[PDB]
Design a protein around this nucleic acid. Sequence first.
DNA 1: TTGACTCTCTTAA
DNA 2: GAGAGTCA
DNA 3: TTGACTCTCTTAA
DNA 4: GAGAGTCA
Lengths: 162, 162
Amino acid sequence: ALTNAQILAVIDSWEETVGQFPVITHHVPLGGGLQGTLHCYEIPLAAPYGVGFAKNGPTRWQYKRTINQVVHRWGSHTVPFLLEPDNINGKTCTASHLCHNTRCHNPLHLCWESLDDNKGRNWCPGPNGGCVHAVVCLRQGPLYGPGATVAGPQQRGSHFVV
Amino acid sequence: ALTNAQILAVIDSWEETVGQFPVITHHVPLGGGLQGTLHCYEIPLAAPYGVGFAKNGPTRWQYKRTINQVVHRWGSHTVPFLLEPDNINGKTCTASHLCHNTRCHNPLHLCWESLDDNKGRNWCPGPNGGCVHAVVCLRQGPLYGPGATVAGPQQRGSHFVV
DNA sequence: TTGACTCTCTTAA
DNA sequence: GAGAGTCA
DNA sequence: TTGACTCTCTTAA
DNA sequence: GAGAGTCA
Ligand SMILES: [Mg+2]
Ligand SMILES: [Mg+2]
Ligand SMILES: [Zn+2]
Ligand SMILES: [Zn+2]
Ligand SMILES: [Zn+2]
Ligand SMILES: [Zn+2]
């Protein structure tokens, strides 16, 4: 809600509730042929999810609190960042999973960045494979690799140069 | 249905027309601090665009030919790939700009790949910076770099470990 | 047969 | 990746 | 007040 | 990144 104290209280109650989510160990590629381990705090697959939480989409949740007798509601991963600017360079800030695990609500696995920065982590070589993200990746992106391109650049005649 | 010969004729007429689009010389990052040059064949900003071409969105065009009284229409960048498989690994193939220049219709700047592969090229370090795409990038992706993350992973209490 | 517009849709963050 | 409404 | 559902929207390929 | 309709 409006006051800094009220926002800190929201963040604290969110952390206490998420802190009781099941902790699931995931072994992940780091890049450079190395492997690491992440501890994700995973929201349940079905109701009940935890105090304040409700599912608004297949992999979308919201956190809800009653303050000043009114309901305030946020996307479930946005709560850690309620005291941060909500835009950067005129682009909306978004919660970005460094563990690439939507059910995870561990704030140590989240950052707050443009949707472009967020998406781009899917292809990052990872913290041991050349990640250049200033807020460093926790793992190699799940889509990193050679790709599966069906056809490359080509011409039939002689009209074009690279 | 169109024969192979008819499809080749479509590709040939498309190439002939695109080959008369203005050719614009662009200096681009290749990765590794190197600069290179790409020559884009850019569709005009406003009508007329060229024989067979019409704009269906701000940066979307289509190519249309009438063969034996039947109107055939394709996305304007898909024509080079009409003799290729249209899906791979259960995903639809998309025209993917290696030059990251939507208006460009140079087929030497296009490849044919899943939408995920296509998107991921935006963040590639480039052919001189560590590109691992099997069909190699022509340039460093426009969104490559450290990013502009507003807030990193953080907690207020001690409920979490990474 | 053709040009120049119109509309909505897909994907996965 | 988001916001908001309908019920109990 | 709290829970468990419903709906549509944003972005840039 | 796509498909399709209307009108002259
Ligand atoms: Mg993400
Ligand atoms: Mg692209
Ligand atoms: Zn996680
Ligand atoms: Zn990274
Ligand atoms: Zn080009
Ligand atoms: Zn590449």
